[PDB]
């Protein structure tokens, strides 16, 4: 995978970020989510590398990046800290400004990065997510059941860590395959093994739990404080139209207040649509990036 | 434990209910909750047996009672089904009417039994619970985090079953001890070993998960249909004042619309106060039962 891309472990502040870099053209940072890592972009990145310098990076707590022990207030795993790492990675790789695409946690990191450092983000695509603030503030019995892990993973360490660690493949496969009878079909075998191998690392089990602890505390408070602001660069809300999120919330409604320049796109898949629709994901991203740059 | 009590496995229809019976005087049925069984009453029952014929029974899906495979609609684990079993158990043991005390799932079973067969329940004590309907209709980010298991346990079989199955002791200890520093202290070793035998039983892991799946579906719907109806017999709302519940809800507010004759009592413990305050629990239940009968 990532034939021809340079593989780099870059020290940024107090953590090291694992990434692959390939291509030429404007920089494009692709950030993964849970329970995955930069390998979710194994097919999409090579397709866009004919026009962009594509960087796929692992968020702190995931894949090959540092996984520090979470602080009692979880602040070292807020999206502000996660975004800072990635923005500094890009600056180190020589890119002061860059386009950003983020799925799941990576989209949340991107949203926070655009609010914290508007000048660094040329465009923002958030894949299959609604704002973290809305997820919690408007939770109801249906949202809490669908997103049960948003609450289980917030339990104090080391409880989720020990429960997950007793059989991580079973635990994460549930988060990845979800409950449809299609469920595991469609994942590329090679990318799926990268999710498996990397998630069995107890330090990554811990780091991802800390990301979720922060989400419901520090991130929620930071997001609350920024409700009077909008992301100003061109933005794309890109959803899996056959997924649970597209079904419980209206994209326009939850995002319009956060994005000053918003476009929409969807593919007929679920939350992990990038895994099943690599080529079409690359196509939609390329069209949006072209629109953004115009 | 339960010295002098008779052990009975009683067929009530399509399930068999495990119970112990002791004492003399009016019938008193004590129903346990999650993640426990009739042994949570090992100290309280002998104290009350000097004035009541005390029956401590295992709910279907728990302890030594039948644990059928959950139906796709979870109806065989509704509180209506669980209540029917216990009312028939009492009738078979010779009692058409009895006092009822329930903690956690057992209190939910009791509320539903009083709504479905008011003439069979002479008095109803609900221990450390607020109504199922409220738990779900008024959920917010704090409630969902505190009662995360109400959402994890609703995930489709066999997922929670396999996650829990990999390390039952770690999973249920977190449910029983909680996150506080004095979490594990103060549980009687003998009673704890009986809860543990259940924790490790795959059929009980499944049964309890199905109880939670029904609670969020069939039970919520049945309860919705009965809003406005109040149980008429004397009732006691008995809570652990040092616990989470007492902290997020007001007992008066959530129970008043459900109980026409309501009294209150509390002990300075958490959700599992019965384990820590057997003598005082019996004292309070004795005082309430006397008041009820008078
Ligand atoms: Mg976070
Ligand atoms: Mg039930």
Distance A155 CA to ligand 2 centre (A): 24
Cis peptide, bond prior to residue A108, ω within 30 of zero: no
Half-sphere exposure of A220 (CA within 13 A, CB side): 18
Q: How far is B166 from chain A (nearest CA, A)?
A: 6
Interchain contact B216–A (C-beta under 8 A)? yes
When scoring B143, B145, B199 by the number of chain A Cβ atoms within 10 A, the one with the most, hence best to mutate, is B145
CA-to-CA distance for B220 and A267, rounded, in angstroms?
A: 35
Interchain contact B162–A (C-beta under 8 A)? yes
Question: By three-state DSSP, how is residue B290 classified?
Answer: helix
Taking contacts as CB-CB distances below 8 angstroms, the residues of chain B near A149 are: 152
CA-to-CA distance for B106 and A202, rounded, in angstroms?
A: 38
Taking contacts as CB-CB distances below 8 angstroms, the residues of chain B near A224 are: none
- Strand ranges (E), B82-185: 98-103, 121-127
Centroid of chain to Cα A247: 20
Looking at B85, B104, B128, B223, which residue is catalytic? B104
DSSP state string for chain A: --TTPEEEEEEETTEEEEEEEEESSSEEEEE--TT--GGGGTTHHHHHTTTSEEEEEPPTTSTTS--PPPPTT-GGGSHHHHHHHHHHHHHHTT-SSEEEEEETHHHHHHHHHHHH-GGGEEEEEEES---HHHHHHT--HHHHHHTTHHHHTTSPTTHHHHHHHTSHHHHHHHHHH-SSSSTTTT--HHHHHHHHHHHT-HHHHHHHHHHHHHHTTHHHHHHHHTTT--B-S-EEEEEETTSHHHHHS-HHHHHTTTBSSEEEEEESS-TTHHHH-HHHHHHHHHHHHHHHH-
Buried b (16+ CB within 10 A) or exposed e, B163-184: bbbbbbebbbbbbbbbeeeeee
- Strand ranges (E), chain B: 6-11, 16-23, 27-31, 53-57, 98-103, 121-127, 235-240, 262-267
What are the residues whose beta carbon lies below 5 Å from ligand 1 (ion)? A 79, 211, 214-215, 219
Interchain contact A142–B (C-beta under 8 A)? no
Taking contacts as CB-CB distances below 8 angstroms, the residues of chain B near A164 are: 163
B64: phi then psi, degrees, rounded to nearest 5: -100, 10
Cis peptide, bond prior to residue A35, ω within 30 of zero: yes
CA-to-CA distance for B27 and B264, rounded, in angstroms?
A: 22
DSSP state string for A146-162: HTTHHHHTTSPTTHHHH
- For A118, other C-beta atoms within 10 Å of its C-beta total 12
Question: Minimal CA–CA distance to B111: which of B79, B145, B134, B141?
Answer: B79
Binding-site residues of B sit at: 105, 108, 149-150, 212
The count of structural domains within chain A is 1
A8: phi then psi, degrees, rounded to nearest 5: -135, 140
Interchain contact B68–A (C-beta under 8 A)? no
When scoring A166, A209, A212 by the number of chain B Cβ atoms within 10 A, the one with the most, hence best to mutate, is A166
The answer to whether B121 and B113 have CB atoms below 8 angstroms apart is yes
The residues with which A11 forms a beta bridge, in sequence order, are: A16
Distance A109 CA to ligand 1 centre (A): 8
Write down the residue that tokens 């809003």 correspond to: B227
Q: Using the beta-carbon criterion (under 8 Å), do B137 and A137 form an inter-chain contact?
A: no
CATH number at residue B26: 3.40.50.1820
Half-sphere exposure of A104 (CA within 13 A, CB side): 23
Question: Minimal CA–CA distance to A278: which of A22, A28, A38, A41?
Answer: A41
End-to-end Cα spacing for chain A: 32
Helices and strands in chain B: count of H runs, count of E runs: 15, 8
- Strand ranges (E), B43-185: 53-57, 98-103, 121-127
Interchain contact B163–A (C-beta under 8 A)? yes
Element (H, E) at B3: none
Q: For residue A81, give the ligand nearest its CA.
A: 1
B34: phi then psi, degrees, rounded to nearest 5: -100, 140
Taking contacts as CB-CB distances below 8 angstroms, the residues of chain A near B170 are: 159, 162-163, 166
What is the Rg, in whole angstroms, of the alpha carbon atoms belonging to chain A?
17
Domain of residue A267, residue span: 1-294
Distance B132 CA to ligand 2 centre (A): 9
HEC-encoded secondary structure of B214-256: HHCCHHHHHHHHCCCCCECCCEEEEEECCCHHHHHCCHHHHHC
Interchain contact B273–A (C-beta under 8 A)? no
Distance B248 CA to ligand 1 centre (A): 25
A104 is catalytic: yes
The answer to whether A179 and B168 have CB atoms below 8 angstroms apart is no
Provide the residue count of chain B.
Answer: 294
Angle at A254 between CA A253 and CA A260, to 5 degrees: 85
Measure the CA dihedral B214/B215/B217/B223, to 10°: 120
Distance B101 CA to ligand 2 centre (A): 17
Q: Using the beta-carbon criterion (under 8 Å), do A137 and B141 form an inter-chain contact?
A: yes
Of the candidates A136, A152, A179, which has its C-beta nearest B148's C-beta? A152
Interchain contact B142–A (C-beta under 8 A)? no
End-to-end Cα spacing for chain B: 31
| Structure tokens, B59 | 């709910």
* Cβ within 8 Å of residue A54, ≥6 positions away: A5, A21, A22, A23, A28, A30, A41, A45, A48
Q: Using the beta-carbon criterion (under 8 Å), do A152 and B151 form an inter-chain contact?
A: yes
């Amino acid at each position: 995978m990532f034939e021809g891309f340079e593989r780099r472990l870059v020290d940024v502040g107090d953590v090291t970020i694992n990434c692959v870099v390939g291509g030429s053209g404007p920089a494009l940072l692709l950030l993964h989510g849970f329970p995955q890592n930069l390998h979710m972009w194994a097919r999409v990145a090579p397709l866009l590398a004919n026009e962009y310098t594509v960087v796929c990076a692992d968020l702190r707590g995931y894949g090959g990046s540092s996984k520090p022990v979470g602080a009692p207030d979880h602040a070292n795993y807020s999206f502000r800290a996660m975004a800072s790492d990635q923005r500094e990675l890009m600056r180190t790789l020589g890119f002061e400004r860059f386009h950003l695409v983020g799925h799941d946690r990576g989209g949340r990191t991107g949203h926070r990065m655009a609010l914290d450092h508007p000048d660094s983000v040329l465009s923002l695509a958030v894949l299959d997510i609604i704002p973290t603030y809305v997820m919690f503030e408007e939770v109801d019995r249906f949202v809490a059941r669908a997103y049960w892990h948003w609450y289980f993973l917030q339990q104090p360490a080391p409880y989720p860590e020990k429960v997950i660690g007793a059989d991580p493949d079973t635990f994460y496969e549930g988060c990845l395959f979800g409950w449809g009878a299609t469920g595991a079909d469609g994942f590329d075998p090679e990318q799926l093994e990268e999710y498996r191998k990397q998630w069995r690392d107890p330090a990554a089990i811990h780091g991802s739990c800390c990301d979720y602890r922060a989400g419901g505390t520090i991130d929620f408070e930071l997001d609350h404080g920024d409700l009077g602001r909008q992301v100003q660069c061109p933005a794309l809300v890109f959803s899996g139209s056959a997924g649970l999120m597209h079904s419980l919330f209206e994209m326009q409604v939850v995002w319009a207040p956060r994005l000053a320049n918003m476009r929409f796109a969807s593919l007929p898949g679920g939350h992990f649509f990038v895994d099943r629709f690599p080529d079409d994901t690359a196509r939609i991203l390329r069209e949006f990036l072209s629109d953004a740059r115009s």
